[PDB]
Every structure is written in structure tokens, then in C-alpha cells.
Design a binder for these strands. Sequence first.
DNA 1: TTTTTTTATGTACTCGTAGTGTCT
DNA 2: AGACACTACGAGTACATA
Lengths: 327, 340, 338, 255, 319
Amino acid sequence: SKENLPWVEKYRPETLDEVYGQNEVITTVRKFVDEGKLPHLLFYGPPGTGKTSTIVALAREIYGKNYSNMVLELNASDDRGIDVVRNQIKDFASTRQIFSKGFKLIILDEADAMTNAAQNALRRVIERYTKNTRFCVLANYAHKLTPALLSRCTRFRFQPLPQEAIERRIANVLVHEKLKLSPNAEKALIELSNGDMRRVLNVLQSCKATLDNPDEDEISDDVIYECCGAPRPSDLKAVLKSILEDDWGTAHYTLNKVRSAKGLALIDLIEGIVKILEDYELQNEETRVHLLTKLADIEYSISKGGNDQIQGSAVIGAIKASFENET
Amino acid sequence: SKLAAEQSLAQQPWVEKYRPKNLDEVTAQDHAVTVLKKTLKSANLPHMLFYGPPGTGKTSTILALTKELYGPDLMKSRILELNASDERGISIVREKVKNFARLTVSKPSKHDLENYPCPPYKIIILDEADSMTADAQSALRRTMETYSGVTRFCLICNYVTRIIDPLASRCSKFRFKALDASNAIDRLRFISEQENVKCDDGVLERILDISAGDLRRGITLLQSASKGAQYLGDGKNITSTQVEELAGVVPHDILIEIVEKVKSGDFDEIKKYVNTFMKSGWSAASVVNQLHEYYITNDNFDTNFKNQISWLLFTTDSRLNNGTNEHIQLLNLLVKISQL
Amino acid sequence: WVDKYRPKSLNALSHNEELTNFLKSLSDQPRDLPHLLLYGPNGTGKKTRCMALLESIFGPGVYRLKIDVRQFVTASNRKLELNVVSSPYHLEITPSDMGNNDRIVIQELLKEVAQMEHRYKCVIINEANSLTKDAQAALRRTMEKYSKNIRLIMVCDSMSPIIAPIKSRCLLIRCPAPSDSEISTILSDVVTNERIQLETKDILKRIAQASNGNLRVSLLMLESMALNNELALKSSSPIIKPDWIIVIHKLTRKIVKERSVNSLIECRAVLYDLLAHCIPANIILKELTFSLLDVETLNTTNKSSIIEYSSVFDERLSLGNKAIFHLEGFIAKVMCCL
Amino acid sequence: MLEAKFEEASLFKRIIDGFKDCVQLVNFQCKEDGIIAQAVDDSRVLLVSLEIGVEAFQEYRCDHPVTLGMDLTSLSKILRCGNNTDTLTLIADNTPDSIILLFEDTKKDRIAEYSLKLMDIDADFLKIEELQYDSTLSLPSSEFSKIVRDLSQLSDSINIMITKETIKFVADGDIGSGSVIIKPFVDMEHPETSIKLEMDQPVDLTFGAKYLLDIIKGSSLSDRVGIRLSSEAPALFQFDLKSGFLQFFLAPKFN
Amino acid sequence: TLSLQLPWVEKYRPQVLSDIVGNKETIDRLQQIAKDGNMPHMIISGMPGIGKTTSVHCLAHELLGRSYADGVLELNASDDRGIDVVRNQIKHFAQKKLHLPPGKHKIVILDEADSMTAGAQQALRRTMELYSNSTRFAFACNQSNKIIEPLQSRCAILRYSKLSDEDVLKRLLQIIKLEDVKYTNDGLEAIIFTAEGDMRQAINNLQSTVAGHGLVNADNVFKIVDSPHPLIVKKMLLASNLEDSIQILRTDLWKKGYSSIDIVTTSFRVTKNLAQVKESVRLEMIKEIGLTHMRILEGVGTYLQLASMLAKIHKLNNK
DNA sequence: TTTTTTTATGTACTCGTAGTGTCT
DNA sequence: AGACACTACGAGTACATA
Ligand SMILES: Nc1ncnc2c1ncn2[C@@H]1O[C@H](COP(=O)(O)OP(=O)(O)OP(O)(O)=S)[C@@H](O)[C@H]1O
Ligand SMILES: Nc1ncnc2c1ncn2[C@@H]1O[C@H](COP(=O)(O)OP(=O)(O)OP(O)(O)=S)[C@@H](O)[C@H]1O
Ligand SMILES: Nc1ncnc2c1ncn2[C@@H]1O[C@H](COP(=O)(O)OP(=O)(O)OP(O)(O)=S)[C@@H](O)[C@H]1O
Ligand SMILES: Nc1ncnc2c1ncn2[C@@H]1O[C@H](COP(=O)(O)OP(=O)(O)O)[C@@H](O)[C@H]1O
Ligand SMILES: [Mg+2]
Ligand SMILES: [Mg+2]
Ligand SMILES: [Mg+2]
């Protein structure tokens, strides 16, 4: 049953009308398929944007419910070498369908992990067998693909999910589940997503689990922040104010009590302070240079461990010394 | 059978003796275990990614969850645990993990379904995912994406940055918080009472203060203090000084001597005192941490001096975190902070 | 000799009485014993104290040990040959005898010893600082999965390269270097047992003042200078210094005397000759910097820059593999500073 | 609970050897009427459809429809563990998992118990293809396998042409060319060596050499193989067994 | 939907050497060679999508006439091209007897010659030397340096260059005239700008824009095909003030879904191929970009790291 | 003017014992 | 019943890596 799959897998789009966020590419692909001219596609974009769902729904719309048989789907989980290409992909492209009549579809998902020799062998397979089969390459990084292979396909960039589409999907989930969500809670949820539907679905399931109730109540900002462990804008701005204006010992005490009262992480506070200070209209760019350099150094040091108190004091001192040049 | 297990636990160090067996034994990581308890009644366990400081209870939490889910019978048949002591290249991830994921779930017995929920999926956990190469990690993407109906993936790591972005997006991120005195004093007091650890008033809270968010190190220090107090047999209570002596903490007077040598003194005297101090074995990380605490906490230095001392201590800790020579780094730090 | 007069039990130790009492406390109940990590200066006597603690946990047969060989196969057909020190109660492994293949030996050997098993078999990991981060990560879970059959006693000189999980997974025991007085008392018993002739006792103190807490170096230097004075130490017996220390001192003299590229070439040659004779580059850098700071011709401004450059290039060497590539850079930076 | 008992244990071996090379994973559907199996090649060029009725099973008991997903490189190893004069027993519990094979000797007393872990194959395989073909021929399996193995050495593509009482197998490569032409005759002295051909319209289409070589591996099952060809339709290579059949739906190469 | 139509790159693929709008010199050279005969061993190198494979295909077709099927041996990177293939099949084709006109020769076309192993390339030397009177070799590669010098010594070297604006514009105008498409000057200009001398990519983008919107206008081309990635990165690095570069990185690159690895790689490539600034400042910028890439590869890839990289680049440019 | 620098998977070659269909 | 050509899958050995 579908009630056992996680929310990321349960709510996977099955038709092209359930893929939100991407409109300029979805309409163009629908027109390509209706008019017949479907070229070799290259879906490039960040994780969680809906490239795999888009191509799966496309193959479903093209071949019907028997998609799992008329399409050759290869990914990084499967062995994709040059010999694998030579045998499997060439035998698939050269032959025809065993279930119906029509062009074939080869979905090379996550093809950014393929060997250079494999791409060099495939770039002539795409150019030779082009009247009976098509190629779809999904990628997160366009630098791992050879320029020859990159030039044979039409590139579609999957933009991050905007506010309207992600709110539409959230409303769809809140309709499918016996769940209510606060408006400010929804805004905070959209803020900690960066256009990643996977994160939204995961944390929505997690905060529904956090409710502890038969779901007769609502999900507020407190639930989201306590479940995702993300700092609140209130505590963020309080720490920033105490760092910018208050005394050194008082700033240290404030940072300690804020990061220990809710169990917040220093890296999340660093990213939040970076995001907040990005809107600050500042004087001569030397302060911004020092701030960015020191904050990136502290983040790279945190990414390897160390003393949290020493790193917090380093953040405080870096912000203070950077702002001391603004006078 | 069970009695042999009880005796082996009783003859085991306190770290493994008091390992959380149920989801209720987790004292401080409540946000994660609440979701884990709620999904225990349902059947929609998502792919999870535990990350946080070492000794926060990630492995213990996932072990307790798998136990409460499957029972001691299906505990050994529906679990695939891969640690850092095994090979986890592309070949292993493609063959073994994918063959276990593609396989069907084992049939539960009649006694299993009567006491445990027995979900229709199995669990593949990968402990210490920081050592996994990014290509072997990307190989797991579709493996965990397509076979999610029959298996669930649980990644465990300390640095969440070492895991690629797609894998971090596919799994639900569970951040384990540091176990300071506040949220771990109850567990430490329980461990002390269960072992009849007669201590003073401010010992346990001090132990965690030395632990810096690490319950395993705190339990080890408590066990060492209890052994040292039982060997003496005086019947007195453990003192905070006796605890900080065996914890590697530099005494207060020796640190005040370092502060005096830094404040007043030239390069030669500081170098000589550092050479003398390095004879007595002290961890440079602890000395740097104590100096940082003293300098930032003392309300007798200028803010301009405080920015510089904080940046210098940060640089010294970042250099020490790479396996450098403790003597050279400590001498350089003290010399740089003496010029201030 | 160092080996002829060495303690074999906890009651035979003659310095750090508090450490001996802590070891006796830790060995009172031996079955509920967690993993241990002995850290401190090199030459203090931690490897003797670990064996003395094993002598308290087990019978006196712990010292009757044997050397065997075990072969391993990596991802290729290159055969890894590793010798093992084994005892009927414990075993000792030194992963510092190979390159990046520490993880394989660690995981395979420890899993074999843990699957075969007072009731547990002790494991002594010698020079844990050379353990690569991947080998330490592999040992991280092996330390916890098998805690009723395998207990680790890791001997190291500095916990700086040891990862935080391993640090947390074992008790930490510091071994401070013995005072000059205890070293002098030990040398006194040694010279009365080896029948040496001392005109004045204070020379022994000077030996301590030349060893910097090292007992292994102290006894060896005492015996080396006892052979030059023909078993009769006088009031002004010269101090026997190792050859590499003299080479480093001459290198510092050359550094402070001439600062040029022509001298940089011969400095690189001296560094090559030192590295080719089984001398680590970190110790070379440490001794070079410490003996350069002792140069009275320089001032505080020069010494501060020297120590900063030495810390920077020590980080570089800990992050690199071509050691001379960092040593020559540090030497050039010091030349530019002076 | 699935409980099947074969008359000869080597028939299942010969049947599985047919799919051993051209098919990786299988999903046996067991019902009250018999065992059906449909599988797709890794390159998805051929489709294997095996059907064995309850006539082959010496004993058969199927309480409810059972789905057994398994691997063939392990089932073949389990089957080779048997014996030539033994009997085979397939057992599966109410919930399909860890199918059990039992080899029992009929001359002596011997019990060989083997297990096989099932696998959860999400892709269903229930498709049936029942459409009229343009030509239906029948020829000895050995005679067809000989021509296939002889023409596979010349090139990688073998073209089949069906005309008015003429069957032509052409192979053009780099070292030369070749073409075997046969005529449908009726052999009264031996019926298993005759060649029948019923054609409605001439046919001309090519296959690959590897799949055609893998198909003829099933010639050890029956003494005669049927070939159904049509205009751009999966060619039906059928070996009829005394309790069912094994049919390969092969996909030609576009020109 | 039942079937698709042939793309314009394959449908309008040139079949005669006159239809090629590539490098005029080499095109007339190959045309005169096909007219007179005596085709020598050749190696055609260049960049993807400029008319290398089509050129050799047209040459072989025009030179062999109807004997193209039995006189031309095509081997691509999709086929095995190891030592065994060169030893057996190529040698059997070169030794094969074939009655040809007194001005033609058997042609062995080897596409993607830069991917052949060293053993096969070494064995091909005497293979092409002993049968150089009845068999000729034409290699088509992108990097001539990947082919060993002994092989290059026995053949002519034809280096194809990028296609200027005029040639691609003329070819697109011919395609539009042959297809009756509604277009505009600014749309074709945007197409050629996004093509970057890539004729295949230009025709592909044109066909995609036609099938997606019908009218080839700059707005449609820009909404269906984003601006070239290296140009925005160059404009970001060449910024004079830190805030402008930060806003460019935020809006153009980070808010559009470009990964940090792609951004840092494009920055490295642009700084390597930069010519506006001096050598020392370029080396310092490359050093900083590599220092940033060392953190991006370790999994610390975020917007803060790129912001710090831009800040350090500006500090270097801040004298 | 002169020869080695770890691990890590992809690629290519060869010898190689081995498993089975065919011939005096 | 058997001998040995044909053969295909498995351990060994190197060779690159923008
Ligand atoms: N545009 C979208 N509309 C609705 N749901 C979406 C959308 N994008 C992602 N999702 C959800 O996120 C899940 C994962 O989507 P995927 O297509 O697998 O992500 P992706 O774009 O392929 O990125 P990868 O796989 O990490 S490279 C889907 O099953 C949906 O539940
Ligand atoms: N939240 C907790 N509650 C109770 N005991 C805990 C908790 N966290 C850690 N412990 C104790 O510490 C021991 C180690 O737990 P682990 O789960 O292995 O720690 P960890 O998070 O895995 O650290 P690693 O493995 O270095 S990342 C457990 O057996 C417990 O005795
Ligand atoms: N000079 C040209 N004139 C006309 N069309 C051209 C020209 N060059 C390329 N094309 C088009 O681009 C398509 C592919 O050209 P190719 O020759 O395959 O590219 P290439 O120069 O060989 O680069 P590769 O194959 O990626 S190494 C042809 O089918 C034409 O449609
Ligand atoms: N308590 C002690 N009394 C006398 N000698 C000691 C004592 N501890 C260590 N030693 C001397 O130290 C020597 C061994 O040093 P070792 O332990 O190998 O150095 P490290 O601590 O660097 O491993 C022995 O020869 C022994 O004589
Ligand atoms: Mg995907
Ligand atoms: Mg763990
Ligand atoms: Mg080409």
C-alpha cells in the first residue's frame, strides 16, 4: 500500500500536471511530445527540483501504463561503463519495441557519475541511432559531462521551486492528510527549504509526528523550529543585536544561553547571521570583505569539528572586528 | 540465555553496560525519539540521516528503534548494519547493498506479530558515513529511491558536510544536540545512583562541563572516579578536584602562571616556561580551551584585545585539529598573544 | 642499559606515585575495564607502565611474548607483510610499519581476534599517531561492537592527530615526564649497580638537564658517556649528543651565518641527507626551530616570525606528504625573515 | 502454500538453462492451473514466456496465487546440486519467502534440502500477446540451431526472409556473406524432421546474432521449434513441451 | 503520439562538400581531393559541432560513389577499437581485394580517434604503412595531442576552427528558407550568441525554439535557453565593486540553481582564459579560486564560500 | 641530463584452468 | 565410450585520470 511509503515517495508526481514549479520547460516538453518533435533532453538542476519525476511522468504520458517495459532507465546504482554502453545501450537503440510500435526512450538518470570513456562511446550512439530512440540525461553538475555530449542534447535548467508552487504542493499535502498549518509556520517552512520539496515533505511528516495529538490542533512555528532544530528569527536577531551593541561578556552569555536553551547549532546561527547581514547597507567594502572571509573560515573549521565555545567566540570577535571598521 | 547476557552486561564497562535499549532511555534527544515513537505505530518510516557531535547517542537511538520495531528475533534478520570497519566502495554498494535492498522482507514468526509492530520493510544502516566516498554515496541514490517500499536507509555521521547534497536531501535530517549539564544531569545522576557513586554536590554537573556535550566521555570519567574512590576505600565522596585531575584539566594555579608569563615576560622566559610545561603531559586542546575561557570570561581586558585573542585561539585550534605538534603551536599561540 | 634495569610490575615503578596509584586503582577490578589511551612525552615510560598494568591484570607470563608474521592482501596483488607481537594474554600491533594500508590490517586483524574470543585479550596499539584517519574511523565502531572480548591500550605521544570519537571511546591517561630529581635517583641506582665511578654526583643532575625529562635518552646517554670515560665519569665529562642533533645545530649556524640561495642549496642537501637516514621531518622541524630560537644574535621580532613560520609549515607538513617541499620552504622563509 | 512435485527433476534444469543466459531475474506466478513466468532481458530486446501446466507436476497443490521473485544464476546452481535419477519438490509457505527445493533419490534414500531467498520485483509480468502472424513455420530444433550457430560466425545480424514456400537465412559480414535457403517439405518416414510453413504475405526482417544464439539454447527441450513472423511484430520462437511451452518474443532491428 | 520526425541537425546534415559552411580552405582542399582523387591519410581535429564528421563522410561518399558500402570501413568510439580489432578486422579490410577506379582508394574512417588505446594506435602504424596504396585512413578527433606522433607523421593534419558569425547566420537563414519559419533579426542574433561557434548546438536551439514557441524571437530564445554560463561568471569576476559581484552571484547564479562546483569550475576556467588583467593577478585569482574549490570538494559548498572567494578576489584587485 | 609517487575504479590484455559438444 | 579442437569466464598486470 502507498500508506507505508514516506511522504517524499508517496507524493511522487505520476502525471505532468502534478509537477509544480517548472512551467516553461513542462509546457515546452508537452508541446514537443504532442507535435512529435522530441529532441534529446538534458535536465540539469539541483537535487529535489523534480527532474526524475518529470521524466517519469513524461514517459508515462508517452507510452502509457506499460512505461516500465518500453523505456531503458539506467542510473548510478547500475553499472554504467563503456562495455555496458556498447552492449546494452546499442542493442536497445538498434532494436525495436517488444510491446508496441514507436520510438524508444533511454533515461540516463544521474549521468554525471559516468566515465569519460562511456560518454565518448555514447556521443556517437546518440548521433547514429536518432530516428528510432531518444536520450534523456539528468544532471546536477554540468561540469562532469563532456562538451561533445553536452552539445548533442537540448538543455533544460530546472529552477528552484518558487513560493507559489511550493505553497500549492503544501496545500495539496494538507488536503491529502488530516493536518492544519499556520500561515507564519508555512512561511517559516518555505524559508528553510531553498526550493527543495524533499526537505519540505520530510519535515512536514516529522512535525505531524511531533504533534502528539489526534491532529485536532494546528502546526505553528514552534513545532517546525523545535522539530527541524532551526533557530528562530527572534533569537537570531537577538544574538546579532547583543553581538553588535552589547558588551563582550554579555554577548558571550547571550550566545551561550541562546544556543543552549533550544540546543541550536553554531553553523545554523552562522548561516542565519550571514543571511541577515546580507541586507545591511554598509560602508566601505573592507568590513564586508573581513566579515565574509572570517565567517567562511570559521564555517570551514566547524565543518571539521573543534571547540564550539572557541568557534562561537571567534564568530563574535570576527563580527565585532569587521564592524569596527564602520565608523 | 538471558542470564548470560545480564552477567556479561554487569561485567561490561559502564559505556556499554548502560547503552540505551529502548527509545525512552534517550534523555536529551527528545525531538528525534518523539518522531521515532510516533512512526512506530504507523508504517511510514522515512530515510533518516543522523548527524551531530560524537557521543550524542545516534547509534544507540537507531539500535533502540530497530529493537522496539523488530524484536530480538527479527533484530538479526531484517537489519543490514555497515560500519566504517568494512569496505564501502562502489563495488560493495552496487552488489551487496543493492542485493539486500532488492530482496524481500523476511517472514515474521507468530510470536513476533503478537508483541511487535513488524513493519513491512527492513532497515539498512550505514554507520560513520563520513568515510564513504562521494561516488559510492551517489550510487546509493536510486538504490534508496526505488526500493523504498521494502527497505529504509539510515545514515549516521558526525559531519553532515561529508555527505553529498542529494543524499542529504533524500533523507530526513536529525540533528543530535550536545549533551551539556542541563539535559544530561538526570542521566548522569541515574548512572551514579545505579552504581552507588558517592560524590559531592557539584561533581556530576562538573563532569559534563568537562565533557563539552559528550555523555560517553562523562560516563567514562564517572567510572574512573568511582574506581579511584573504591580503591581508596576511605568511604568519602568524590570531589570535583579529583575528577578534573584525571580528566586532563590543567590546575588553576598552573594556568595563572601561564597568564602571568604571557602578561609580563619576554620571548625567552615564555619559551623556557613552555618547554618546562610541555614536560608535564597536558593536551594542548584543553590548554587552549582553558585559556579561551579565562580570557573571554575575565572582565578586565579591552574589546580590541578580546577580538584578537578570540581570532588567535580560533587559528590555534584550527591548526591543532590537523595533527600538528602541540609544543610548536602552543608556543606560537602564547607568543602571539603576548605581543598584544 | 635501559633494558637490563626496567620495572616489570606496578610496585617496581619509581616515579609518578600518583600515576602508579591510579593504575593500581584501575587494575583493582580488571574485567569492567574500558579502553585506555596513554599520552604524554616520548621517553616517559608509558610503554613500561602499560605492560606493568597488564602484569597486574594477568599473570607474570605477559612478558614472555613471541614475534609472529601475518600476511594480508589489499585490493591488488601487493602482499602486506606485518609482524605481530603476541602473548598468551595480550597482543601488540604497530600500524606505523606501513603506508596507507593501516585500515586493512586494523579491521581484519581486530575482527579475527574478536571473533575467536581473564576473559578478554588485550590489544596494544603502538604509535597511534601514525594511524590514518580512515583506519581510526574503521576502529571507531570496532572498539564499541566488541567490548567484551577486545580491550585497546593505545600508546601515543600526542592526542593531536587522534580523532575525537576515538578520544571519547577510551579513557585518557596522561604520563608527565619525571622530574630531574627522580631521573637523578634512577641514574644513581643504575651507576651503583653497573659499577660506575662518579667523582661528584651533580653530573647525574646535568644528564637530566640534557634529557628534558626523557629517561630512555638519559640512560642511553649515561651509558654512552660511560664508555668514553672508561667506566669512570669525572667532574667535567662531555655530554654525548646524537649525530642528527649536531647536524641540525650546524644547519642553524649556517642559517644564522649566511642567508642566500647558494646556502639554501646546501641546506636542501643537508635536509636530504637527514631525511634519507630514517629521521622524521616533524622532529627535524621541531629541533631546527627550537635551536634557532636559542640563537642569541636574533631578537624578539625575528623569533616571533620564526615560530609563526614553523607553526605554518608544521601544518603544511601535517597536510602534505613531500616533507622536504615544506622543510625547504620553512628554511627559505626563515632566511627571508633574518 | 505452494507444494509442487516434479516427475523428473532434470526437466526443470533444462527449462531454467534456457533462461540462464538471456534472462537475469524471474518472477514465477503459481496458480491452480500451473506455473507461468515472464521476463525481460537486461537490454530489453527479448521477452521470455514459460508456461508449465499441472500435467508436468507429479503432484501439485496451490492454495492461493503465489508470486516468487528470484535470481537465475542462483536457481541454476541450486538445480545443478541435484541428480539425474532424483525427484524435485518446490515448497513455498503462505507468504512467499525463501523457497525450498527438495531433491529426493528414487533408487536410494537421500534428501537434499536447499533454500533460495526471494526478491521483491516491483515490475509485474502478466502480459499476453495473441495476434495473428504473417507466417508460421515449424522446423527441427537441431536444424535451426545449426544454421543459427553457422551464420553467427559471419556477422552480428541475421536476416530472415519468408517467401512463397521459401525460408532464407542471410548473413552479410566483413569476411564474406552467406545465405541458407530451405523449402517446406513433408517427410512421411519421420514426422520430427519435416518443415512446415504457412504464409500469408512475404516477410523480411533482421535480428541480432547474440539473442538468436541465446534463443537456440532452448533446443534441448523439444525436438521441433516453431517460428511465427509478422510485419514488425515480436517474432515468436516457441518450444512446445508435453505440458506447456517456452516462447521467446524477439524484437527485430529497425532498418 | 506514435512516431517522431528527424531533427534538423540530422535531416539537414550536409551530404555534399559544397553545403559545408565551415573553414573554406580545408573545404576546398577536400573538394579538390575528391575531384582529383588520391586521398591521403588525414587527421581532422577541432571542437565539437563544427563539421568534422560530416566533412569526412561527404569526402568518402563523393570519392567512392556507389562503392561506399564495400569500400568504407566506419569505426566509432561506440565499437571496440582495441589492439585485437586493429590486428584482425582493420588488417583484413586493408588486405581485402576490391576493384576500384584508378583514382580511388579504400577509406577507413575512425571517429573519435582521441579515445583509441596506445597499443591500437601503435599497431595501426605499420597497418597503414604496408597498405598505403589500396587503403587510406581518416581520423576525426577533438584533441590532436591524444594521437601519438608516429601516427601524425604519416598523415596530413587539418585543424578546424570555430565558425564565424556570418557562416552560422547564413546556414540558419538557409534552414529557415527551407523550413518556412517566422523569425526576427534579434532572435537570430540571440541564437548565434548562445551558440558560441557551435553549428550543431545552434541548429538544435533553433529547432527547439521553433517547436516550443513557433516564432524565433530573442525573448523566446532567452526564456527557453539561458544565457551562456561562462559569460555571467566573467562579468561577475570582472566586477569593480564587491556588492555588484555579490549581487550577480546571488541573482544570476545562486538563485537560478547553479551548483557551487559548476560556479567555481567556471570561475577557474574564465580566470585561466582571461586576458583583460595581468599574469600575476590572474595567478593570484586562480590561487584563491583553487583554495575555494578545495573547500567546495570537501562538502562545504555554500553561498558563503563563494562570497568569501569574491571578497578575496576583490581584495587582491584592491591593490 | 634519467627513473619511481600511497590509494581508487574504469579500461584493456593475456594467459588460464576449466566445462562441455563433438570425431577416430 | 573417449580425445581433444573451441570456447568463454576468471585471476594478473599494468595505464590513465584535466
Ligand atoms: N516540482 C515538483 N512538484 C511536486 N513534487 C516535487 C517536485 N519536485 C520534487 N518533488 C518531490 O520530491 C520528490 C523527489 O523528486 P525527484 O525528481 O526525485 O528530485 P530530482 O529533481 O530528480 O533531484 P535528484 O533526484 O536529487 S538529481 C518527488 O517524488 C516529489 O515528491
Ligand atoms: N542520549 C543518551 N542517553 C543515554 N546514554 C547516552 C546518550 N548518548 C550517548 N550515551 C551513552 O554513550 C554511549 C555511546 O553512544 P553512541 O550512540 O555510540 O554515541 P555516538 O553518537 O554514536 O558517538 P559516535 O559513534 O562517535 S558518532 C552509549 O552506549 C550510552 O552509554
Ligand atoms: N559547416 C557546417 N555546415 C552545415 N551544418 C553543419 C556544419 N558543421 C556542423 N553542422 C551540423 O552539425 C551536425 C553535426 O556535425 P558534426 O560534424 O557531427 O560535428 P563535429 O564537428 O564532428 O564535432 P563532434 O562530432 O562533436 S567531435 C551536422 O549534421 C550538421 O547538421
Ligand atoms: N618507573 C620507572 N623506573 C625506572 N625506569 C623506568 C621507569 N619507567 C620507564 N623506565 C625506563 O624507560 C625505558 C623504556 O622507555 P619507554 O617506555 O619505551 O618510552 P616511551 O614511554 O616513550 O614508550 C626502560 O628501559 C626503563 O628503564
Ligand atoms: Mg533523480
Ligand atoms: Mg556511532
Ligand atoms: Mg562526430
